[PDB]
Specification:
The structure is cut from a larger assembly and holds two copies of chain A, one copy of chain B and one copy of chain C. Chain A is an all-alpha fold. In chain A, 95% of the residues lie in helices and 0% in strands. Chain A contains one helix and no strands. Chain A starts with a helix and ends with a helix. By secondary structure, chain B is mainly α. The chains are: A mainly alpha, B mainly alpha, C alpha+beta. Chains B and C meet through helix 1 of B and loops of C. The complex binds adenosine-5'-diphosphate (ADP) and magnesium ion. The site of magnesium ion has 6 residues of chain C, from loops.
Chain lengths: 55, 77, 371, 55
């Protein structure tokens, strides 16, 4: 037939598109999270040196 | 007062797997098997039987023609 | 032993043993006495055909449903239906099986008390329990929160639940359901020439509604399209020939759900009573209810309703919340599947109304702790 | 027919689940990156305050 092929292929394409988009988003989320952790760690030391400067 | 349900232990949303994943594959495979066996049993046998009945019908037609002609030959007076 | 999960419903009685996937016997709940005289002798003509037998002899019967809107209006017929269900469709005597009936929310007390009195005196069951039809539909989805819209054939009710704690002040019960849609379809078919009047022909109109009608995503655009082209006109063959062609009656029949002003009802559609039911809830559980909106019941099987309802609620709701509508493919039997799951639980095994308890407190036991 | 409809329904369940996961991951990325950039702005303001204290 004809309809089954096109509908099935389009739906599988939709699933694959959503999956890859989710993977890209999660990768960027993990990278941003680690960079945020770095920012926290540096900010604490910045606060410590600021406190010493103020003393 | 509204009823008070005694406290139990577990579970919920954990039987969705055991009632979904089962038929997610078993049902599909079993229905494919049913369709395959039904098509095999039905279509080819029906076409072959119809051809057989058609041949018998043609033979009946020949017999009818012969008998009709011989009776018309004799009875024609 | 095993429990009997019966589910009276209104339009289709669904029953079966606890612990399975689908009800064992599903058949319309109609009891029809013959109306003509009858001349053949010894034909073995009975005085009342119930269940699926009266959907085959409906040409000479006067079918009448014993349940109008959730409530039961004709107790003798309902007793007959139950007797048929137990003895002929399941063939299990009720003396050896617990039963789990289901009841719509906000129903009259006398109905429930009479139901339990019948089950304990006539059929003489060991123990029976009555459960609200929406909690079961929430069981079947495997959730524990969510607001369930159970649009049956008798009555549409909308019970919100959070973390297992039902909110009794936010139940919005509306009496528009599948039967009113059947009557409205039968009333608008007369605009083309087809007149269905007999109580038997209501079944034919119901079949037309099931097989052809669908819910439009946008009503005005569909009304404009059906009035210009002819790509919508689908034909259907009556039980005797004379095919009929349904035009824009296709999406006008189920549109009554979202605009109950069509059949003269004042209230707002099923798209706005859900939002009102949510807004009565507390301010901190509205996000979860928005994200876990559940559909159930037969009448929510129209092709294209899970998109129209989502569009409407997204229009009403704040723009930030995510609106998700759970529409499982097994919608029709969702209540019964949930009933089977609930009856199969070990924690629930001590909530049944045991017969000795009924003997000590009378039928009014159902309103007590054993709810 | 019969099996074809069920197979389509399976292909649609995969569609819904994949699409929902993709959307949720995208929302997670948006939230996480906003968190990181606000932390970076806080770090910048701390640097400026340290500069004023040094002056
Ligand atoms: N496939 C379908 N499409 C549209 N409407 C349906 C479909 N199946 C059932 N209905 C409607 O739903 C009703 C059955 O609802 P049901 O869930 O059995 O009610 P109850 O809650 O009493 O069991 C029927 O009267 C019919 O009008
Ligand atoms: Mg129901």
């Amino acid at each position: 037939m004809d309809a089954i092929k096109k509908k099935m292929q389009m739906l599988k394409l939709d699933k694959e598109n959503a999956l890859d988009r989710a993977e890209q988003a999660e990768a960027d989320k993990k990278a941003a999270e680690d960079r945020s952790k770095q920012l926290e760690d540096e900010l604490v030391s910045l606060q410590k040196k600021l406190k010493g400067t103020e003393d | 007062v509204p009823p008070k349900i005694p406290d139990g232990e577990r579970v919920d949303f954990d039987d969705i797997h055991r009632k979904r994943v089962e038929k997610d594959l078993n049902e599909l495979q079993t229905l494919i098997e049913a369709h395959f066996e039904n098509r095999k049993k039905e279509e080819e046998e029906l076409i072959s039987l119809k051809d057989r009945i058609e041949k018998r019908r043609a033979e009946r037609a020949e017999q009818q023609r012969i008998r009709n002609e011989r009776e018309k030959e004799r009875q024609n007076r | 032993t095993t429990a009997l999960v019966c589910d009276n419903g209104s339009g289709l009685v669904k029953a079966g043993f606890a612990g399975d996937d689908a009800p064992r016997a599903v058949f319309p709940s109609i009891v029809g006495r013959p109306r003509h005289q009858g001349v053949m002798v010894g034909m073995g003509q009975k005085d009342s055909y119930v269940g699926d037998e009266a959907q085959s002899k409906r040409g000479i019967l006067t079918l009448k449903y014993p349940i109008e809107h959730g409530i039961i209006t004709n107790w003798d017929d309902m007793e007959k239906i139950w007797h048929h269900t137990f003895y002929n469709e399941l063939r299990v005597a009720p003396e050896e099986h617990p039963t789990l009936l289901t009841e719509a929310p906000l129903n009259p007390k006398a109905n429930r008390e009479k139901m339990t009195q019948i089950m304990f005196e006539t059929f003489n069951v060991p123990a029976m329990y009555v459960a609200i039809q929406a909690v079961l539909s929430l069981y079947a989805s495997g959730r524990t929160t969510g607001i369930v819209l159970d649009s049956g054939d008798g009555v549409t009710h909308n019970v919100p639940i959070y973390e297992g704690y039902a909110l009794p002040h936010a139940i919005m019960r509306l009496d528009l359901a599948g039967r009113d849609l059947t009557d409205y379809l039968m009333k608008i078919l007369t605009e083309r020439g087809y007149s269905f009047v007999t109580t038997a022909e209501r079944e034919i109109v119901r079949d037309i509604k099931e097989k052809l009608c669908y819910v439009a995503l946008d009503f005005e655009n569909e009304m404009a399209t059906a009035a210009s082209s002819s790509s919508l006109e689908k034909s259907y063959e009556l039980p005797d020939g004379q095919v009929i062609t349904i035009g824009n009656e296709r999406f006008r029949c189920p549109e009554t759900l979202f605009q109950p002003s069509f059949i003269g009802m004042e209230s707002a559609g099923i798209h706005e009573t859900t939002y009102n039911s949510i807004m009565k809830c507390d301010i901190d559980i509205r996000k979860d209810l928005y994200a876990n909106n559940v559909l159930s019941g037969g009448t929510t099987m129209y092709p294209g309703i899970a998109d129209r309802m989502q569009k409407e609620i997204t229009a009403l709701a704040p723009s930030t919340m995510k609106i998700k509508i759970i529409a499982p493919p097994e919608r029709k039997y969702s209540v019964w599947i949930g009933g089977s799951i609930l009856a199969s639980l070990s924690t629930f095994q001590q909530m049944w109304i045991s017969k000795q308890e009924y003997d000590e407190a009378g039928p009014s036991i159902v309103h007590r702790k054993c709810f």
